Design an enzyme around this catalytic site. Structure first.
Site, PDB file in Angstrom:
ATOM      1  N   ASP A   1     105.459  47.135  37.072  1.00  0.00           N
ATOM      2  CA  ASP A   1     104.294  47.787  37.661  1.00  0.00           C
ATOM      3  C   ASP A   1     104.327  49.308  37.504  1.00  0.00           C
ATOM      4  OD1 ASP A   1     103.176  45.377  38.965  1.00  0.00           O
ATOM      5  OD2 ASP A   1     105.031  45.468  40.132  1.00  0.00           O
TER       6      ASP A   1
ATOM      7  N   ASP B   1     105.428  46.272  42.909  1.00  0.00           N
ATOM      8  CA  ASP B   1     106.734  46.080  43.514  1.00  0.00           C
ATOM      9  C   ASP B   1     107.856  46.261  42.498  1.00  0.00           C
ATOM     10  OD1 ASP B   1     106.193  43.743  42.063  1.00  0.00           O
ATOM     11  OD2 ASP B   1     105.919  42.479  43.841  1.00  0.00           O
TER      12      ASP B   1
ATOM     13  N   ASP C   1      98.030  43.901  45.605  1.00  0.00           N
ATOM     14  CA  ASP C   1      98.575  42.624  45.216  1.00  0.00           C
ATOM     15  C   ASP C   1      98.251  41.784  46.458  1.00  0.00           C
ATOM     16  OD1 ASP C   1      99.719  43.358  42.743  1.00  0.00           O
ATOM     17  OD2 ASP C   1     101.516  44.169  43.751  1.00  0.00           O
TER      18      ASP C   1
HETATM   19 MG   LIG Z   1     104.471  42.157  41.058  1.00  0.00          MG
END
Ligand SMILES: [Mg+2]
Ligand SMILES: C/C=C(/C)C(=O)O[C@H]1C(C)C2[C@H]([C@@H]1OC(=O)CCCCCCC)[C@@](C)(OC(C)=O)C[C@H](OC(=O)CCCc1ccc(O)c(CCCCCCNC(=O)OC(C)(C)C)c1)[C@@]1(O)[C@H]2OC(=O)[C@@]1(C)O
Ligand SMILES: [K+]
Length: 994
Positions: free
Chosen positions: A707, A703, A351
């Site tokens: 996910d 996070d 990310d």
């Molecule tokens: Mg995220």
């Protein structure tokens, strides 16, 4: 259960046919429940100690051992009274191994934690409903809520089911969807339906997701879906349907199991075939029982000789060690087996924000139009010092410091920043630093204000505490914030309606301040403020504005841009419906552009190089951001994913572009792409499956709970230290500092760990090969047991265990990162290497067998049966008048075994030095290179001596200490090994390719 977000309140009350005022009727409840089940997540799978233990005894080798543990147990139940009492120790120990091994596996799984279980941490125990059977509200058990019945939720409450909102009983309703969508700040909900039926959760504004918390307010709603049908339940399923492969080394261990099993079996047939002449013996049971006992006790020996009983012990301890070694470096490995798969990562998807950058926003460029005179136009660009959220810095025009006040345009711009913004600043005295209160991008506009206080309003003589929001609150009091039209991804912008407050300001009373995506808002601007005046937004002025907007987002700056404008004549207050994200865009039109602000999300220090490392390490790095691909690509160039002049046509896609592609090109894209911007949830999971269809070992960062599906499917899921618990329990590794560079560091230790781990495995294996050779000759020639099960295990768990684990501390190669990723399918022993061990084992197999025989015949201590069947030793008490003028008991003697066991022990310490390098000679890579190695070789030897002298021991191992001359013989036998290997290495080194 439905797609309620798109449907209207009535339609939903229609669907379920439930009265908003009565709720469901007790009948409707029974009917509904039996049709939609309880509102809870699927019960846990039921595993019992029994199954759990049986599982421990499923492995093939573990079985082979358990079997032998019996042949042994029975054999020892057939010893000769006082001739032996230690008889029951051989079988007893094998069990302890198996018993131990089981106990481990079970404790291992009891302490385990299921990622799917964590989810249940997001299910409230109770909920509040309105049913026909009662006038007032009832607090029932979440599990019993059903799709359809009416429910009311308020502050503190954790949402029970997926709810469509019917009516907000409060002035405003705020929710914390952080976990499910990844928006730290509480969002605002409305009642009006959302047109699109395929909308992503983030945009379902009339929706309450189960598990999220209600930040502020109270509201009422009709339950859309419950149980496994809710947004979270859909995740539980993707995760439960997700099946994870075994570590390649774990695979190799099953591979080796099946094989060993074959070989051993063939050996038996061979051994039997050899002693075939026995079918030509006189027919009479002359030790018919003494011969079968013999083979069976060779069977058990053959088994403990082929299986490396200490290898899993060694691997587990090498993994645990490196693991701690990583913890120090902020890489928290949850599953040990993974430290290997990690080492083979070929693709890393990270990310951006929290991990690739600091997420510590700051504005460093502003620009307000200075003049429009037809086609002529001139802007007023600026720069602002400071990266921190600290009210310290200056404003410059051409690097020259300036007092912001002097420009009218800036006085306006500035306010908009303090008024529109919901975020703010605080200063915590304990840490003595300024902290971001709201959102990173708004809390930035906050410090921008502070750093440019337009009115010069003196603040220097203030403490840091009050200094935090000084210049904003100044502007806060000028105008009065009436109400705000929150952000909405459709119009990409937010605003605020404002009153003048105290009179003398009455004229030009109500104003409306806007801030959003430039292209967005600027297309809604019909005017432009040049100072205090205004002028019709013309094409020339517009091109010039959109031009600078691109140099800022596309240029080496890689800046995020925010357009600030204002609606001078805002629609009459009552003519506005403040509760329909849909109409806010219409209220934010006929604007006069005032100026844009460009802020920066600086990449982390240790990121630039980390990205370079991966280049050398042949690891592809794929970014996953929210930026548009224009700036996304810029950020990708800034850190190294792309070159500054490198083409990126088919190497950067957007969530839409990608979706608009057919499954074929979609797949093709993934083996080349690197920058994926504005990516929906489903995506992370598709990109993984594709990277897998290319046999690649990929890593995926995440996070939140959204996910988890992706993380659980990536070969290695990387969770954020700051991220949800479910996310963590779903990933193999966690990043305390959330820093991407921690990933890379982790991968390098994986290559380092597998390199050393690689060797000690080759080491312990070869010894097992040679041990088998010994046993094979022992039986192929009918000699007396040279090595005994009890002894062998010692050598395999301890005498070789020490050297083995020490080999795990071999100095890492300098070029570990300059070589591509290892192939998982790479076998540990093949080709030329296979042959060396084929030869080394062949050797020790001879050294061990002969070492013992040499004591019988040719030794001064032992009775030279020299060149006469020592072999037919079994037929002895009878045949003594023939070729046996001695005592038929020498054969039971300890000296002989104590000979082979010593040659084995010394040959395994020698073979431990040869294992310091696959092909480098010791003369080049001396043994002293790895101290731990030599040290353990001492600990080992003394241990060998211990079991030779300390009284209780010698007796159970059937070992008698040998003198100073017999020992020297051990050396004359073992040592040659080092030379045999140097030679075999020299070959690899100089002829065979390499
Ligand atoms: Mg995220
Ligand atoms: C081993 C002994 C013998 C006799 C044998 O015959 O071993 C076979 C055998 C099966 C091999 C061959 C070898 O062939 C021969 O020796 C022929 C000569 C026969 C002579 C007969 C006359 C004397 C190996 C060996 O030979 C050579 C020259 O090393 C080479 C390879 O070993 C490897 O790679 C190893 C790395 C992979 C590998 C990686 C990780 C591991 O843990 C392992 C082994 C450990 C498994 C668990 C056992 C430990 N404990 C346990 O299970 O339970 C406990 C804890 C005890 C409770 C292997 C393999 O080819 C392996 O089979 C595979 O699938 C390979 C391609 O791995
Ligand atoms: K996984």
């Amino acid at each position: 259960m439905e797609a309620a977000h798109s449907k209207s309140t009535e339609e939903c009350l229609a669907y379920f046919g439930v009265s908003e005022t009565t709720g469901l009727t007790p009948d409707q409840v029974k009917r509904h429940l039996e049709k939609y089940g309880h509102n809870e997540l699927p019960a846990e799978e039921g595993k019992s100690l029994w199954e759990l233990v049986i599982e421990q005894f499923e492995d093939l080798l573990v079985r082979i051992l358990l079997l032998a543990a019996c042949i042994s147990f029975v054999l020892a139940w057939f010893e000769e009274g006082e001739e032996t009492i230690t008889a029951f120790v051989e079988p007893f120990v094998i069990l302890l191994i198996l018993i131990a091994n089981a106990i481990v596996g079970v404790w291992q799984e009891r302490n385990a934690e299921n990622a799917i279980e964590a989810l249940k941490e997001y299910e409230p125990e109770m909920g509040k409903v309105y049913r026909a059977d009662r006038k007032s509200v009832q607090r029932i058990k979440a599990r019993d809520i059903v799709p359809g019945d009416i429910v009311e939720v308020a502050v503190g409450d954790k949402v029970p089911a997926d709810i469509r909102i019917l009516s907000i009983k409060s002035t405003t309703l705020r929710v914390d969807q952080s976990i499910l969508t990844g928006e730290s700040v509480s969002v605002i909900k409305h009642t009006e339906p959302v047109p699109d039926p395929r909308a992503v959760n983030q945009d379902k504004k009339n929706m309450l997701f189960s598990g999220t918390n209600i930040a502020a307010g109270k509201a009422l709603g009709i339950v859309a879906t419950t149980g496994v049908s809710t947004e979270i339940g859909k995740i539980r399923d993707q995760m439960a349907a997700t099946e994870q492969d075994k570590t390649p080394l774990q695979q190799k261990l099953d591979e080796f199991g099946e094989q060993l099993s074959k070989v051993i079996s063939l050996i038996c047939v061979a051994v039997w075939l050899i002693n075939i002449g026995h079918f030509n013996d006189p027919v009479h049971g002359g030790s018919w029982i003494r011969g079968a006992i013999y083979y069976f006790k060779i069977a058990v020996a053959l088994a403990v000789a082929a299986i490396p009983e200490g290898l899993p012990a060694v691997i587990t301890t090498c993994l645990a060690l490196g693991t701690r070694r990583m913890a120090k470096k902020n890489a928290i490995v949850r599953s040990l087996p993974s430290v290997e798969t990690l080492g083979c990562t070929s693709v890393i998807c990270s990310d951006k924000t929290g991990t690739l950058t600091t997420n510590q926003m700051s504005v460093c460029k502003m620009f307000i139009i200075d003049k429009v005179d037809g086609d002529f136009c001139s802007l007023n660009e600026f720069s602002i010092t400071g990266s921190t959220y600290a009210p310290e810095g200056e404003v410059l025009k051409n690097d020259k410091p300036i007092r912001s006040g002097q420009f009218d345009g800036l006085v306006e711009l500035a306010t908009i920043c303090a008024l529109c913004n919901d975020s703010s600043l605080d200063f915590n005295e304990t840490k003595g630093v300024y902290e971001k209160v709201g959102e990173a991008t708004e809390t930035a506009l906050t410090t921008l204000v502070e750093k440019m206080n337009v009115f010069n309003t003196e603040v220097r003589n203030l403490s840091k505490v009050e200094r935090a929001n000084a210049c904003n609150s100044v502007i806060r009091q000028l105008m009065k914030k009436e109400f705000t039209l929150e952000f909405s991804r459709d119009r990409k912008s937010m605003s605020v309606y404002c009153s003048p407050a105290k009179s003398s300001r009455a004229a030009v009373g109500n104003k409306m301040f806007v801030k959003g995506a430039p292209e967005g808002v600027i297309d809604r601007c019909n005017y432009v403020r040049v100072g205090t005046t205004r002028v019709p937004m013309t094409g020339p002025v517009k091109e010039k504005i959109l031009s600078v907007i691109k140099e800022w987002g596309t240029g080496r700056d890689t800046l995020r841009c925010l357009a600030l404008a204002t609606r001078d004549t805002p629609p009459k207050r009552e003519e506005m419906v403040l509760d329909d994200s849909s109409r806010f865009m219409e209220y934010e039109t006929d604007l006069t552009f005032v100026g844009v602000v460009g802020m920066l999300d600086p990449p982390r220090k240790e990121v630039m190089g980390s990205i370079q490392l991966c280049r050398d390490a042949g690891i592809r790095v794929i970014m996953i951001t929210g930026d548009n691909k224009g700036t996304a690509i810029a950020i990708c160039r800034r850190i190294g994913i792309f070159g500054e002049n490198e083409e990126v046509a088919d190497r950067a896609y957007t969530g839409r572009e990608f979706d608009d592609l057919p499954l074929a090109e979609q797949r093709e894209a993934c083996r080349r792409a690197c920058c994926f911007a504005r990516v929906e949830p489903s995506h992370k999971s598709k990109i993984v499956e594709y990277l897998q269809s290319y046999d690649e070992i990929t890593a995926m960062t995440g996070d939140g709970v959204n996910d988890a599906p992706a993380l659980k499917k990536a070969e290695i899921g990387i969770a954020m230290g700051s991220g949800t618990a479910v996310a963590k329990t779903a990933s193999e590794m966690v990043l305390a500092d959330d820093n991407f560079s921690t990933i890379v560091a982790a991968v390098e230790e994986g290559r380092a760990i597998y390199n050393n781990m690689k060797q000690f495995i080759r080491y312990l294996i070869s010894s097992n090969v040679g041990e088998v050779v010994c046993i094979f000759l022992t039986a192929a020639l009918g000699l007396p047991e040279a090595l005994i099960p009890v002894q062998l295990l010692w050598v395999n768990l301890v005498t070789d265990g020490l050297p083995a684990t020490a080999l795990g501390f071999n100095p890492p190669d300098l070029d570990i990162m300059d070589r591509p990723p290892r192939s998982p399918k790479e076998p540990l022993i093949s080709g030329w290497l296979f042959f060396r061990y084929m030869a080394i084992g062949g050797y020790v197999g001879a050294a061990t067998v002969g070492a013992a025989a040499w004591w019988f015949m040719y030794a001064e201590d032992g009775p030279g049966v020299t060149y006469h069947q020592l072999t037919h030793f079994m037929q002895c008490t009878e045949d003594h008048p023939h070729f046996e003028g001695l005592d038929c008991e020498i054969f039971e003697a300890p000296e002989p075994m104590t000979m082979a066991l010593s040659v084995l022990v010394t040959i395994e310490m020698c073979n431990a030095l040869n294992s310091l390098s696959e092909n480098q000679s010791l003369m080049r890579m001396p043994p002293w290179v790895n101290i731990w190695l030599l040290g353990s070789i001492c600990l080992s030897m003394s241990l060998h001596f211990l079991i030779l002298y300390v009284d209780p021991l010698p007796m159970i191992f059937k070992l008698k200490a040998l003198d100073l001359t017999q020992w020297l013989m051990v050396l004359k036998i073992s040592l040659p090994v080092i030379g045999l290997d140097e030679i075999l290495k020299f070959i690899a080194r100089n002829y065979l390719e390499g």
